Each structure stands twice: as C-alpha cells, then as structure tokens.
Design a binder for these strands. Sequence first.
DNA 1: AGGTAGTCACAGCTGATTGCGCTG
Lengths: 322, 258, 115, 380, 38, 179
Amino acid sequence: FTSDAKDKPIGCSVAISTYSMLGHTTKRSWEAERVMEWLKTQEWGLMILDEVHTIPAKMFRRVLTIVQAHCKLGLTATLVREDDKIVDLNFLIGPKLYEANWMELQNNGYIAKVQCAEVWCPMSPEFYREYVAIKTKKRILLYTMNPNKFRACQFLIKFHERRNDKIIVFADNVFALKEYAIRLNKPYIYGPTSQGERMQILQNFKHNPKINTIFISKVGDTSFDLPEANVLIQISSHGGSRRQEAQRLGRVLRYNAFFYSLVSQDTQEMAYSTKRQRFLVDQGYSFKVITKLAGMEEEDLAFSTKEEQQQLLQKVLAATDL
Amino acid sequence: DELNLLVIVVDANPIWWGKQALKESQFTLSKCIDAVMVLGNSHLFMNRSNKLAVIASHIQESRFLYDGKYELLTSANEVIVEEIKDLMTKSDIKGQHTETLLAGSLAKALCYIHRMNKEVKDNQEMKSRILVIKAAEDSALQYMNFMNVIFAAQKQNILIDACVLDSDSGLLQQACDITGGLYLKVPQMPSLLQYLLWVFLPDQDQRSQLILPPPVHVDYRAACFCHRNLIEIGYVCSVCLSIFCNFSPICTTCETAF
Amino acid sequence: RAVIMFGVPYVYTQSRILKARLEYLRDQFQIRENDFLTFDAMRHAAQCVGRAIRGKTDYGLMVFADKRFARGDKRGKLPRWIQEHLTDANLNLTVDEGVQVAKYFLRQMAQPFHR
Amino acid sequence: TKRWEGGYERTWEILKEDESGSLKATIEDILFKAKRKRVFEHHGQVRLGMMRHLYVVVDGSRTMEDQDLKPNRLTCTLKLLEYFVEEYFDQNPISQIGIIVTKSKRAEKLTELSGNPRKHITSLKKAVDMTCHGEPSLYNSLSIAMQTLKHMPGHTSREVLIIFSSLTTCDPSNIYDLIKTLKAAKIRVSVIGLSAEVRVCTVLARETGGTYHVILDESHYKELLTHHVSPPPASSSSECSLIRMGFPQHTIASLSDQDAKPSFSMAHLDGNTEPGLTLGGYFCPQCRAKYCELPVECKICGLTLVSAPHLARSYHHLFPLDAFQEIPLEEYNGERFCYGCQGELKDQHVYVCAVCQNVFCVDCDVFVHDSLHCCPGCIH
Amino acid sequence: GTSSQAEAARILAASWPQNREDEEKQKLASHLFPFEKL
Amino acid sequence: VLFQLYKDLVVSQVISAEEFWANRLATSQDIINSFQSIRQEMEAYTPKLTQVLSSSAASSTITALSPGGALMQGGTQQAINQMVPNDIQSELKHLYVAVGELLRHFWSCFPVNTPFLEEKVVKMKSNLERFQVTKLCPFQEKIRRQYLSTNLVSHIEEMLQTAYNKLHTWQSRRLMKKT
DNA sequence: AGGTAGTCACAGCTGATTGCGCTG
Ligand SMILES: [Zn+2]
Ligand SMILES: [Zn+2]
Ligand SMILES: [Zn+2]
Ligand SMILES: [Zn+2]
Ligand SMILES: [Zn+2]
C-alpha cells in the first residue's frame, strides 16, 4: 500500500505500507481513502514498525494512534536520536527489549570487523582566511571543499580501487558533491535524479569490475538494498547526528572492511566528528587518528599546484545564496 | 621480557661411564656433571628471567636433577648433586636393557616446557631450547618415539641441540636439523665446558650474530618395521607408509584394517 | 538454459483476416484493437518463454530483447509467476548489464540446494 | 509450537551458594570445563591414504582473460594451483602431480607426472605469461591423461582434476565413449568450473565418481582446491602393493677429511647456467647419483628417493594414543606428582594411563594426546 | 610550475601535525591501515 | 651436445652406431664389575672448580673454533666456481651426462630376467670400460698436469666401481644358481 | 545578559498535472 501499483490491499493477510501516508493532514486519494477506511476498521496483530528511531515525530506519533494493533514491534539499528525524544518511545511503543552487543557480534564473524578511521586534513592557507573571515553559515563549503581533503579522498579511492574494494562515498551538501564527483568522473546520486537511474546505478555498482565506487548524498542515510561494500569514505556529514554516522557504518558491516571519515582541522567539522562518534565508541569501536597518508607525494593528485587551489576559492565563494 | 628456558638432558648411562672409568681417561662422569652445572650457572647468570632444568637420562627411568658463590646457584648445584647421587647410587642393574631412554627424557623435557609456558605471564614469551649431551650409542628400538618427539618439538618451535661426546647418533642429527638446532661432536672431552660456553650458551637470536660451525652431514636412514635396523633401500607400503626391508605379499600393518 | 525473444511477436496484420476479427471484437465485445494485439503478442511471448522451466530442479534464463517490453501495458500481460521475478532493476538495462545479470544468476544457480 | 515462544531461559541459575562464597568453586569448575575443547585429534577425518597419480588440467582459452577474479582468471588460477600443489605434496608423501594445458582445440603436456614440487611451481610461474587463445578440448586432455595413467599400477588411485573456465569444448570424436573408457579404467575425474554448470562436466564427474563444482569467488575456489587436497579413503588390503624406494642420507663433504669429493647435481645438470658443483648432498643409495632436492625419483636407476621423516610424520595415525582414564583426585590413592611435568596435582581430576598406570595432569594429558602422540611412561 | 609544485607540497604535507612529529622522530601491523603498510 | 656425445662414443670406438640409436629409440660379568666400580667411585663425589677447565684446554678449543680450525675450516672449496676452468667443467659435465646415460641403460637392463639381457649387460660393461679408457684416463692425466686439488674424478670412479661390483655380484649369484 | 521560534540545506512521501509514445 504505497500508491504505486495498488495490489488490492483490501482483504489481505499481511499489509506492507510506509510512513508519511497513514498520517496525511491533507486531502487523500479516493482509492487511498477507501483503503484507509478499510484498514482502520479491524484489529491488527504485530504491527511491525521499521526504523523505529524516527517514531517520535509530529506526524509519525499519530500513526500509532490512527490504527489499532495489539502488539507493536519496533526494529532499528541506531536507536540514538537528538531532542531527547527517545525516552518518549518507552511509552509510545514499549521498553527496549533487546540491544545487540556489536563487539561480540563481530567476534563471531557474522558481522564485518570494520576498522574505523578518523583522518583529518589541514586547511590550506588560501581557504582558512576565508573560513575565519566569514561566519554567517557560509563557512560550510570552505572546510567541505578543502583541497587537502579532496586529495586525501582521491588517494583513498585510488588505493582501494587498486585492490578491488567496493567504495561508497557519502557526502551531504550536494553542491560540493557536484564538483567532487565530476572531477573524479565517477557516478553519483544527486538524490532527486529519478527512480530508475538510481536503481540501475546501484545495480551495476556490484556486478561490474570496471566501476566499483559510487557517491551518495544523504540518500543512503536509511535502510536500503545497497550491495555489500568494504570501504566507506564520508565527507561533510550532518552536524552531530550520531544516528547518521551509525547508519553509514551499518552500510559496511554485513579487518574485512574499513570506513574512513574525512574532516578539516581547526574547523567545526572537528567538533562534529568528535561528538558524532560517541555512539560508536559506546558500541565498542575505536577511531584511529590518521594524520599522514603514506605515498601521498608518490603519485599525482588533483590540486597539485597553488594556482588551481586559489582558483577553487572563486568558485566555492561563488554561491552567494543571498 | 625475554625469558629463555634451557633444559639440559645428560646421558647418564652407567655402562658407558663405567667403561670410561675403566679406560682411566682424563674425562669422567664427575667432570661432565661439573661442566653441565657450570653451563647452567652461566645460563642463569646471563639474565634474571632465564630458567633452568636438568634431566638425567638413565636406563631405569629419567630423573629430574633440577661460601663466595651465588645463593641460588649454590642451592641449585646442591640439589643437582643430591639428585645425581641418589640416581647413580640406587641404580641397580636389573635386566638386560642397556640402551639409554633418551626419547623418554626428551618427552619429559617437552612436557616440562609445556608446563612452564602456561605459567609464563602473557606479557612475556618463553623461548625454550633443549640441549642433549650424548655418551652411549644410539638406540634404534626408539625410532618412532624419537621421531614423534622431534615433530612435537618442531611444532612448538623448540630448539634441540646435541653435544655428542664419543659416538655419533643419527637420531640426534635428524633432531637438530629438523628443529633448527646445532649438532656438534666434541674432539677433546676435557674441553666440554668450553665447547658448551662457546657454542650452545648463546640463544638463537645471539646465534644469528655469532659465527658458528656449519651443520654436520645429517643422515636420514629409516628404520625397518620388522628389523628396526638402519637401511638404505627398503620396501614402503602405499597405504600405511610402513617401511620393510624385504618384499611381502601381504602387508603386516595393513592387517589391522579389515 | 536461456530463451531470447528478439522483439515483441506481433501477428501479421495483412491478409485481411486478423483485421476482420479486430473489427468484430471492437463492435461486439468492446475490445480495443491495441489491447487485443498486445494481449496476443504477450501471450505468445510468455507461452514460448515459459517452456524452459519444467520441474523444480530445472532453471533457465529469460530475456526480452525489445524496449517495448519495458512498458507496463505489456509487462502486466505476463503470468504472475514471472511478474514477481521481474524486478524493476532490470527493465531497460543494456546488453552489458544484462550479460552481467545472466552471469551472476548462472553462477549462483549452480550451487547445490535442498528438497 | 515454537522454541522461543515458551519460557525465557535463565542461564544464571546454574551458580548457587551454600556457604556464601562458593562462587570461587563454581568459577574453578568453569575454568576446568573450559579446557578439553578438542577430541584429542588434530584431523579427526581420514587416518590413512593411498598413492595418487593426479593430473591437473588448466584451461588456456580466451575465457581465462576474463576479470572475474582479479586480475584475470589465469593468474588467480595459477596462484591457487601453486598453493594447491604445495599443500598436496605436504599432505601426500609419495604422490605425483601432472599438469596439462589445453589450448586451440589441442592439449599440451606442460609437465611430466612426477613428485617434485619445485618443477611444477616453476612450470606454473613460466605459464603465467602464456597466451590465452582458442578453445579448450576436454577430449584431448582426457585422452592424454588416460594414455599416461593406463599403465600405472592398479593399487594407486588414478585421479584427474580439470579446471574448466570456458563453457565450450571442441571434441574431435564422441566424448561419452571416452567417459565410458575412463570409467572402465577406474580413473576418477573431478571438475571445478568457473562460469556456470556445464552438462558434460556433470555427466563426467557423476560417471567417473568425481565431484563437479562451480566457483562462487576466490575463497570458494581455494576451499574447493583444499578439499581436493585431502586423500581419498583406502580399502583394507587389495594386493601386494609395495614399491622399491631408497632413503638417501644427506652426506655433505668436509675438506677436513680426505674424502671430500665434489660432484655435479644431476637435477642442476639440465640447467642452462653452471650446475651446482657443491661438496655434497643426497647420494643415491643404489647408483651413488647426486641430487639436491627431495623427494626426487632417481634419473639413472629409477629408484624413488624419499625422506624418512616425511613418511614417519604420518605414523601417529596408525597407532593413536588411547584416551587416559579420568580419575578424581580424592579417589587416586597414589603419588600426587605428574609424571610428565613433575608438578603438584591440585586439579579435581587426574588422568591415569591404561598401560603404565602413571599420573598426568590436565595440561600434560592435552599435550600428550594432541602433540606428543605418545605416552612418556610407555616409552620407558 | 616547477617551484609551485614544491611550495604546495611543502605547505600541504607538513602544515600542523608534522613540524613537531618529525622533530620528535629526529630527537628519538595489525592496527596499521593497508595504505600505511605499503 | 648430442652431436658431441655421438662423436665421443661412436667415432672414438666407445660404442657402435647400431647400439647408440637402439637405446635412443656386551661382555661378560666384567660389565657388571665396571658398573659396580663406577657406582662406588661416584658414591663419594664432590664438585670441582679448578679441574673443570684449564688454560691449555680453552686455548685449544678456541683455536679449533676459530676460523681455519678443524671445526671452523676456512678453505672448504675456496674458488671452485672459478677453479678448474669452465672449459674443463664443460668437459666434466659432458662426461657426467655420458656416464649417467650409460648407467641408466645398465640399470634399465637390470634386473636380468632373460638370457638375451645377459649379452646386453656384458656389451654395456664393455662400452663403459671403453668410455673410461678413452675419456677418464686423459682427463685424469690433464688434472694431474694442472694439479687440481679437487677430486672431481672420484665421484665417477665411485659410480663405475659400484656398477662393476653390482655386475660382479650378479654374475657370482648366477654362477651359484647353476651349481 | 539569556533562550525559543523561524529558517536553510537536503531528503522523503503522496496528490494531482502534462507531455511523449502508440502494433506487421
Ligand atoms: Zn624388513
Ligand atoms: Zn601397509
Ligand atoms: Zn640411483
Ligand atoms: Zn603434568
Ligand atoms: Zn602410558
């Protein structure tokens, strides 16, 4: 029941639907209205809720009260959430029944032993002056588009491609991702692209040796059908979302694998990375700090000279969204 | 954190030392025991963490042997002397067995090393080596047990060093070659202590730096199942790999499997 | 192991025999001509492509080498035992990705199974 | 009903107190129970074997250039074949390996059937830089293998391993007749596919008694090769299966003695460069021919030169050590010192050998059953 | 430019965490990442 | 090499041309007395300090263990990689190949189970003797002229002696079987 | 001198429009 095929949800044993449709505050479709009328007139056994962390929302809390069910099962991987609304979930659904021990789970070998890395890249002098000069939300693109971080990401991509490792590169702030992906000439998911293009890109990402690295912009921040991957390189994530970091880590486990987080020194991204890993260290993960990348000068990387680095300031300051 | 264990196996066969005393040579069992004790004292001198064990190989059984001098060394030497006296004085020849039980002594040494390794704290690794001084002739009846002991020592990475006095032993050569130990034949018996201090005293890490005599010509003659004698060419079964000196229509060992 | 359909099999509209039946169904049963032609084409395609699966242990590869198959009005005419196995991922994929999908399927179908 | 829909398990009910502090006794029991996690056998499978004359057939068609296994199928196949040859010669003392490469509808005998591992590894390294062209011919490879193995003695198990990358094979004649001939010759054929299942390979493996498998990834390929390493079970007793082989002692020459006689190695004589004229090595017990590597069959008199420790390493399987009788410490009215390590017996259980009735602790019992494979008391 | 490459490499490779770690090295595998072991 | 081998065996009358290509195509109670004596001697035993080692013994041991000593021999084929020049080494390799082929033929003939092989083994022994007289004796003379310290010919002599002893033993067995 | 509702970025969903293809 998602208003795409309408596979006769009336008279069904197991019904599968989604949020943001059972709690509409606007006019509903005639077929959808009839389906909701049928669905709100009988008891339900074991209403399974997926991604239970985003239950305490303005429109998602009423979904539980808009239907009648006997047992409410909540399943999630990252129960952490800001605004301290997780406590409300204790009475919204019930108590926390099971909490998997991730360390002993990866000890049994059924969960990939991911080697977490927190590698920072120094801010170039041509970028740090603009970073410290402006403060009205215009500094996000400055530490995101750090040339040193760009070189580090390119080096990591090339090194893990030389050993045939599937790489998923998460990158919020899609404006930066646009010039980040076309420079490397690699596929990327802008996010409002289509339904078919994303499906075909994710389908040819796994069973193809020619292409083994993709870029995602906040789209993979939920539970999808992404194939098995070994390397995750996140750049410019959200502010302090422990949920987002835990979800991104969960896309790797399935040292079999390793995931990297790239941050810019002497910027707010340092504090963001520090405060967004406290969930994973509670889970038992240790984030090794990588300051130097071996063989950085061994091969050629982008932004080798200062001319293009200082030219990058012009385009990164060209947003001017005022 | 480098703990070195030196288990010294002394061939205490009464018949060979009795013949040596009859020869009235300059070398006797007393001088050999003194050299072994001095080598053990030097090994304990080299480091605090070093551990020492002395096993006497005798016909009846194997005996664990272990005023201005070091206090611990004094007690160790007194214990060694008391144990060797108790072994030799109470050694009564009861039977026609004359070959020394070298294989049993090596098995006991391996068991003692295994016991010591567990008691070693996890912050330290106990490197273990076994030094054997050979006096009597080699024993062929113990071929299978000796080979099993060699393989067990190789599995746990335990060096086996042989210091042959009079007659060469092929089993000791094979043990030294397989386990990576040093095989040496002493030309002048009174110089046994100097040979031990010069060659077998350093550890394997120290043996890498020091220049040492090259390995001797190790033989690999096999033991016939029905004769237990050294052979050059023999018949070997394809199923059980048992070795026979002569062709047989029906393998004896394969009889077990019906 | 593989059944390949080179284009949607459409009956010959000539000879003035099919068109008479189309007109009769149009003016008698209110049957759309396009709907009936698509139904016949997909019925023949499914009938000739479903003969590669005879028995539980039997397996086979089914491809449709025409972009017209990708449209919903023709996929909906396929039998239900083929619809759920035709995921939306492979509806317009090129030849290379079709070959890759075939390789993965054949490799994963050679392993032993149970009863 | 369901197992998990009944009563929730309370695993912590095991521990109990009677004197307020017996938890130390419980954890001592738990620590004792933690040990003895094995069945006192390192392998626990096939305790014997038989002389195997294995022929390995490698595809050399254009399909080997595919990049399913990085970098290509040929390189990964040859690396895993080197590993397989090493492990197979490690676990089979008197076995022989032959390598056949099929290319352009013909089969080339890359290496003769022998027991030298170094020659096979060198041949594989040389074949790493081969040219992948044409199509494979299973018929020709099987014909060559059958022609070579027809004259081998019956007691040896004749096996053929085929690495079939290409899905198409060209046969100059009917292949099912060749399969029937192989079945009549009691030659076991095993095939490891790379792309997908081929009917002819399945029929061949089923009829000849072998196994046919298809690779999922490199790890699965290595697992299949490792499974092929293990020897097959051997019948009780067939006939007078024996073999004349020598045991060349490694007699090196020292100039301190007057009998220091340098000699060229027969194996090194065939090399382009200067052969190693070392002081000594392995001299043949029959014709005094000199060889450096073992086990290598003698080129002159045909005697098989093997190493006695290699044959003796498997002797513990023939005579496994019987498990010692577990006895509680209180019920043992004897000495309280272990016979192996001389340590004081303070464990609740003491193990006594059935033969010599000696005393062994838990650690010494585990060491004897797992590694030593002999009772120290029984040796005396 | 020839000098531009050297200047950019000097600035980038040794900005904050190298002017002191290298000094300590001058005055003085399981947990190593794969690119740090090559 | 094969052409050189053919000339050295056929032209030099070592073997005939027909045969060349044919193959190509303890004591008494005194021991108890000694045991009792050593037991009594070691019953009163004390550790010693001076008698354990002496300066002369230590010096002799160091001399033996120093490079160039008995155990630490320093010579040990100093420059055999360059001694006896490779021109002779090529000839020695050719002789080794010829001896190996002839002995391979001999050991393939063995064991003799038919009367036909008896003449074949005699002809093989005659060929071996002719090859020895033709090549090894001039080789030994050349070595003596150059005074090479290496006993290169010794291995070939050992192999020939082993083959001759085996053939003589087999002939002796054959004679005894007919008695 | 301190704190909460707009606000921006980026994503999701569903509810309609609206624009290109549609047979041998
Ligand atoms: Zn025998
Ligand atoms: Zn047998
Ligand atoms: Zn030989
Ligand atoms: Zn013990
Ligand atoms: Zn016993």
